[PDB]
Design a binder for this molecule. Structure first.
Ligand code: IYW
Ligand code: MG
Ligand code: ZN
Length: 312
């Protein structure tokens, strides 16, 4: 059978949480199939259907600075690392579902927040009043799955198919960071009181949600040079949104104001402290082998503190 193989450095480094997929766009599909074959099996998907699905998903990501095809594959790799470090915790359908959910989680992103869509009065804001872009991303995923020769789940039973699309829907919705705060609090309480039960489906859902947030935020868990350079792409989109807010006659939050570029280092600290560190802390409590994500995140926090202190 046709197993995908990577050069030695990638073969070894792809196993590590802090792996960067590199600047060679044309290797990213092969990298994803490699991860599916090792995470799921060579039999999970028909290679011809999977390759066709991947290339349709790629085509439906836009040429935006951050919310692009590279982000999709980067988020799928973090999930690969979590699944490979927690072999026995996840079902066959979950391993299939979650890598696909990650690849598809920002399909057709325009580089704008749900907030900006609401203030613009975008049609999608009327179709989906909450988790606006996330319901769109799930919609695009179902659209692509329904293209001729793109149904990678065709060999699942009716019930297994409904289950995997339900895993994907919940996983993609959970990437709405507005939903992350409450989800982590609940997981924090369930862990502390000892009521967390991975046989409770509503509990698994919450844990998959936190994994999605962790994979989505995984830029902050890279080596400093990757984290620092990704921050430029993230802020390029924030500043364009801020520009579009000013065009609507609305002063944007400082994070999106390119006039307030001086405030970015302190804004990063807040994000690490309010979002990233709590996310990887709770994830590490629930799934101990994901500790390297927390360790790498703490290292990047310390780098941003150094930027503030003029040490860079
Ligand atoms: O660096 C960042 C700064 C701010 N925010 C958003 C935010 C800040 C404060 C309170 C709430 C929300 N996110 C990031 C970040 C790091 C990695 N990914 N993302 C990200 C996530 C979703 C969308 C776009 C980017
Ligand atoms: Mg998103
Ligand atoms: Zn994302």
């Amino acid at each position: 059978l046709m197993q995908f193989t990577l050069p030695v450095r990638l073969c070894k480094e792809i196993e590590l949480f802090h792996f960067d997929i590199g600047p060679f766009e044309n290797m990213w599909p092969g990298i994803f199939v490699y991860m599916v074959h090792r995470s799921c099996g060579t039999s999970c998907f028909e290679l011809e259907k999977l390759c066709r699905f991947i290339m349709s998903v790629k085509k439906n990501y836009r040429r935006v600075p951050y919310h692009n095809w590279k982000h999709a594959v980067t988020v799928a790799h973090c999930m690969y690392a979590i699944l490979q470090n927690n072999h026995t915790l996840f079902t066959d359908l979950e391993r299939k579902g979650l890598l696909i959910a990650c690849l598809c989680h920002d399909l057709d992103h325009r580089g704008f927040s749900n907030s900006y869509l609401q203030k613009f009065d975008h049609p999608l804001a009327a179709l989906y009043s909450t988790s606006t872009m996330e319901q769109h991303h799930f919609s695009q995923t179902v659209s692509i799955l329904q293209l001729e020769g793109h149904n990678i789940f065709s060999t699942l039973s009716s019930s297994e198919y409904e289950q995997v699309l339900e895993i994907i829907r919940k996983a993609i919705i959970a990437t709405d960071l507005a939903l992350y705060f409450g989800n982590r609090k609940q997981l924090e309480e369930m862990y502390q009181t000892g009521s967390l039960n991975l046989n409770n489906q509503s509990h698994r859902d919450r844990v998959i949600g936190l994994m999605m947030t962790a994979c989505d935020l995984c830029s902050v868990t890279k080596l400093w040079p990757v984290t620092k350079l990704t921050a430029n792409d993230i802020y390029a989109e924030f500043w364009a949104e801020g520009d579009e807010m000013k065009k609507l006659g609305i002063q944007p939050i400082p994070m999106m104001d390119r006039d307030k570029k001086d405030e970015v280092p302190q804004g990063q600290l807040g994000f690490y402290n309010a979002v990233a560190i709590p996310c990887y802390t709770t994830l590490t409590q629930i799934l101990p082998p994901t500790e390297p994500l927390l360790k790498a995140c703490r290292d990047n926090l310390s780098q941003w503190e150094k930027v503030i202190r003029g040490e860079e």
